[PDB]
Amino acid sequence: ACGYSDRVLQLTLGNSTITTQEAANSVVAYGRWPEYLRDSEANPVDQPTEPDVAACRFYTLDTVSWTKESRGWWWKLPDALRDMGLFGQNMYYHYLGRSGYTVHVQCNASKFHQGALGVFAVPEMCLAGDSNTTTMHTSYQNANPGEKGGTFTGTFTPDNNQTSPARRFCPVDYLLGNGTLLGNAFVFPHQIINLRTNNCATLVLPYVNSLSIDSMVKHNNWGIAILPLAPLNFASESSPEIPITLTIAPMCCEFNGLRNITLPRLQ
Amino acid sequence: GAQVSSQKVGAHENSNRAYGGSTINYTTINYYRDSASNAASKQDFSQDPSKFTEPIKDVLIKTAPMLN
Amino acid sequence: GAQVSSQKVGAHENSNRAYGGSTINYTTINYYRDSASNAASKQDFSQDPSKFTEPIKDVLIKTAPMLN
Amino acid sequence: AATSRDALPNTEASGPTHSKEIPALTAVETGATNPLVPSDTVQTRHVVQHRSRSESSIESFFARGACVTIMTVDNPASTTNKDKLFAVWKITYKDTVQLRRKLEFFTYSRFDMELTFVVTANFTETNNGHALNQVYQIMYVPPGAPVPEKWDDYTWQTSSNPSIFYTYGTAPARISVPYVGISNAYSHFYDGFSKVPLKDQSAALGDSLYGAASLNDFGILAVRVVNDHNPTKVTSKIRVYLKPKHIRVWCPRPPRAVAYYGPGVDYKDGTLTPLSTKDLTTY
Amino acid sequence: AATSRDALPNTEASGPTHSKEIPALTAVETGA
Amino acid sequence: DKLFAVWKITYKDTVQLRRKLEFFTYSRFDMELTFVVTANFTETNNGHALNQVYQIMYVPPGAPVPEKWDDYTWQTSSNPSIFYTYGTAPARISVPYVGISNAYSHFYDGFSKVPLKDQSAALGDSLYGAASLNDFGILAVRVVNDHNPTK
Amino acid sequence: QVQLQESGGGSVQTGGSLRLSCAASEYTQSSACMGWFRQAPGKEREGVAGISRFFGTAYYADSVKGRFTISQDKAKNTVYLQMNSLKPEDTAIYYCAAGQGCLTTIQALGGAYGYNAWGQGTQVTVSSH
Amino acid sequence: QVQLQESGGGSVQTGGSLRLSCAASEYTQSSACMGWFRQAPGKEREGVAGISRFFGTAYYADSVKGRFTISQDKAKNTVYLQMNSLKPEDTAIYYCAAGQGCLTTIQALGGAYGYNAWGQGTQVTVSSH
Amino acid sequence: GLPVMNTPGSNQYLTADNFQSPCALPEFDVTPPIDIPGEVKNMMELAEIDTMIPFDLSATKKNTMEMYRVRLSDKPHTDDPILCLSLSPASDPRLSHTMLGEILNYYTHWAGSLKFTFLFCGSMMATGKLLVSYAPPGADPPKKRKEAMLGTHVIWDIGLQSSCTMVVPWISNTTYRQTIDDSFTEGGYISVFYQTRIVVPLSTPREMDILGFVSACNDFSVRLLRDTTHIEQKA
Amino acid sequence: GLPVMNTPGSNQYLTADNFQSPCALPEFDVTPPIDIPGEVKNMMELAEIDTMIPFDLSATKKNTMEMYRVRLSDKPHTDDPILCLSLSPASDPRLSHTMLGEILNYYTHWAGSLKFTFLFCGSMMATGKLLVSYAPPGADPPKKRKEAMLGTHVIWDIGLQSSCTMVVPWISNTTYRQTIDDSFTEGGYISVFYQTRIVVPLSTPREMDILGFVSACNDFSVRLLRDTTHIEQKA
């Protein structure tokens, strides 16, 4: 009647608004909308910190490039927001905290471009390491790359430097870096940015853990995996490129156990 | 404090003046104070897979166009 | 002469037409004449630690000055 | 109100059609799986369904015990040089594989564990001497309690540690333990660490294992043969079986596709080949 | 009437204050 | 290598029971199984053995069938298994009507495959009267006890 | 399936030894008597050797007894075929054959009828070069 | 904690034997592989030796294998470290290291990562006086 | 004491048992649960979710991201199949590793309807028509548009609605089917063919791929719990 | 007799069992109880009572009355801590021997709020102000008034009301904490600092001491019974 469509959308969190014309509706993980911590479920006694619009708004990460030889890309939450304005500040100063997020990945092309990108939100995205000598051997620094995130590879490469090991992840793409076929990845809340149809993928993720609140500094609750399901091709050129961008927004952001600044060693 | 439950009869004995037909029930008695000690009731419930199948914000009408 | 008591349910079985919800009780039967033979009921009571914490003759008002 | 053993909906009769209602066509990019039935695409008959998902409920799927470990203890001669063997084993589901993977279909779970203890025993030295029926004490040593150092030290007195006294040749030992997690559910995958390495701290002082936490530390199981030194040695193995009854689960994950390698998610070289050979144009 | 397995009292919401009621200060010499 | 037995579940190895069943063409029933276990020394020696425990695992069609007395299969995460201690009441379990059909067929007048014209005779052959209607997997058993000096 | 992957195509002279092997690692209702079939492009496909999965029920074709023997590894999982004193009459393409439910190779004893998973095929020539 | 109290600071010449010991009497989730770390004031802190609490899982740094051995008393509770044929390159401050839940030294095998209780430190000099 | 009698089965340990037993830690204050989103009630609902099929399992493509891709081209019409697939959800390599199948590997019997959804991931300027076919077993496995066209099939138009689902209805002799590869309990054949052909304009990638997904329908069930063979521990 | 069946666990002895058994002395005239003052209902109420903390555990002071004393001085203001303490009630030496802790040693999990009370035992003519601080874990352990001031803290005035209590509120990731020294279940840091400084007139002892006590709050609980390690028998 009024022309309302599921492709055309606009979402607003704070002083930031996202708008699109080629959407494929919107996904709410496990059918649960993000929420504040209920009294019946609460645990820390102190009165909590609810930053609101201060932290809860859209945040754009550093844009990456999609080409024919890219194997995939990954990010963790909250990790990927550790240095984003207030939220991050609020993260570094409080022992505990919880939050939901509305992840919006952007990537438009042309009606002459093709390819499909799988955007998967994996709660507890514990990735696999690079050593065949020692397990669960990836260091904190390499585990949490922050906003830049990381990538997947098509070939496993075991680190043989036993003197000063690399201590990083070596996430094989087809095993979705966890030892499980990417094919089943669809079990996780997800969407597919298939160039023909859509230019974006929007997923709403509630706070998911084994407990009401946790130390966001020590633990990542959600992972963001983006892998090309179909390859990127354009016309007849040999090396096409199309940028991909992720804007993330916390939702129902709350924190407790306020104390002094945490200064982690990131390198 | 007995717990009498029903049995979904599969194969039927040529009986209905004892077995077969007339609702066959079983008894269960909890002997321990802690719930952790109890046997599995197995009388569970199903749900709608939607939260996994249709985790979409907007209602999906299967007969209509997915994209509209 | 059975003794049927309740169980404070911890983990819940996806059940409420047998287990899970609808109050799960247990039975106990004393087989011996002497009380010394019985098992521990475990259905005990709490008290106020005062007799150890505030063994003071005069009423302690936490908001007021201890010494006045 | 739909129970696990209730009949699934009947498939109803449907004839021919030709209109503007589109069941066959959708869009998976939205992330939604088209919920079609046969009548949407083909002409079907009225069929009273009788089958039920009784056997696939979480309860039913885990309604079985699984060997989690195999412990080894003995009772040698008094004249021996090496000390009598007592076994210590940290309680985990991750030494074996079968059970682990099942558990791993999900991210989180709540359950009360039922443990059984099958005990085997045998002679080892080719002699003709004799042994008298053995009794085995399986003590549960929770994190913090003193873990035995000798088969005959003060720990085996068990004033507050749960302990089992199993006589050989009788019904295998079985106990129950409630949901004992420090969290609100047992976590099968942890995307984090225990410590936070800080800038003004030595890297050594700030390191921890990836995916390792207390969420999973339940202490150890200690066992010995209660019998005193016997002239001819006797070997014995306690096989533990875990059944997670009264179970609840959260967040489905894809099942392990490559053989496990350690308690983590790591995999080794040359194991990364799960699928065989099959040509695209052949049945 | 408080059993061993009954829930301990809930912790209730409390905001800011500044007055003459002294919770923090007492005297242990009294033995309390 | 230490001997472990594997046996496909059928009523047709013996005769007595078979014929009774054969008075009819089809039947529905819930099977109750009992397990009487015997044991003996074989080598004329004077060595000793400690009471044995036997695990009878049910391996349904599709599940991994043991190759060793000590391989990973005997872990039994979903296969039904019995742990029988020697010298005690024989083992007994119950199994419901497990047929793929609506009743167990005692006689099948057919085959499994259809040999087609444009297929090799080899590719189209099957046994007469043989079908899945009767495949219930196997029963695997071993002595849980570790190697003993005298067999 | 099971895995059936075979090799061993060495064109030896008349009277030499050759070994053939077929993988059977995965354990479905595992290859009972197993199976070895040769297709002579002059004739057709025919059954040859076979030893029961567990038992010692090894059937031998009239033409190959004694010279050709069947054996396997009840662990390393692969099926060996010792073919010695090779005639020029045995020049054909060999194939391994999984006969599932052991009774498939107990009833009929020999394979052929109860065989569902087919092998790849190895060319063996036994000539006078 | 556990108790960790170490000593044994004898400045021996290049090629002599030295013994290091760390107390571990109290039995918490006891020192699994244990741990020995040396800090060379030119370099930094590094892992060296370690034998599992109960099991014989003893890891040895590339630079110390054979010469340096780890062993303890499963009763008298103290951890010994036989360091023979001492080079001048091993002049550093040693430290014992409790790695609790044995799996801490089973997963990673070596210490360093699963280590919560830190030792005191003994200065060992191996020089040409 | 009360006169009692021991009947067979006494003292035995059946792993499939369900009885009560004494507690190891009496009066333990169990931690109450919290509403963790995404709880599952039964294994089948995981089965109803669409997972991607590793179709082309050639020596080169197997165990690589490419196995999920089914390449299509703008080649002139041919009656040759694009892909052939056997209805053995739990035993045929291509189906065996999908969640559906993997799940099926924990059971011995499988029954009910299945659905195959296909996703065209070519350019918008690309057009085409295809025929996805399901033939019940018993006859010659289809290999040309012709015979396949005789069975159950959906003719799919490539357009704005990116995906198409073909439902393979439950057509079986038996009440339940075997998780194993078997003749008596054979399922049939699944096949895709070009109806027209793929058509693109100039300056448009001439070759593209398609993605395929398979899941169970609301009336799919499994029975007889068994251990899977897609997992194992060596020594 | 009544047909019965033996299920697993039969004949075993679990020390944690709770069943009835035959009496050794039937009809024994048990002596009735008398009202003995001071009966206890639960272990936690002992926990709520304030016990003195052996703070300074230096080589010289440990195992001596002096370990309970925390010396203060009239030295000019400094931003350095008077005492540092880790929130590991059941595992840190200083807390480990207090009734609270000792009790905690009989359990594996601990949860709830705690309270630290401090007693100034200097002269009446002595004045001063202090800052007692509790910082939740995760950051740099406080070592200067500055960072500590950022966390939970009470600023205490030395006067007629001799003691001051700081409540360490239950702020945890987990529902319950470990009796062991552990990172995941770390509790945080407790710290005392001079706000002003200690001031006394002439003819007044320039240095004095302070006493510290710790106890549980009405909502403190423990679970998982285990044997302590602060007691043992050699041979």
Place this chain on the structure above:
Amino acid sequence: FCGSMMATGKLLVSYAPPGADPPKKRKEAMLGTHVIWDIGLQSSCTMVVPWISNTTYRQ
């Protein structure tokens, strides 16, 4: 947007209140008030700069 229909793109229009470093990189601008605009069938996009002032009126 007055480019061709076949042209696609996404932009970020940003309004930052004064007082800090004037934005010059997507990063800082992204922290302020902003609309992320998709180029499509709806040709234009409006970003509203809300009244955020110290004074009641500006010069």
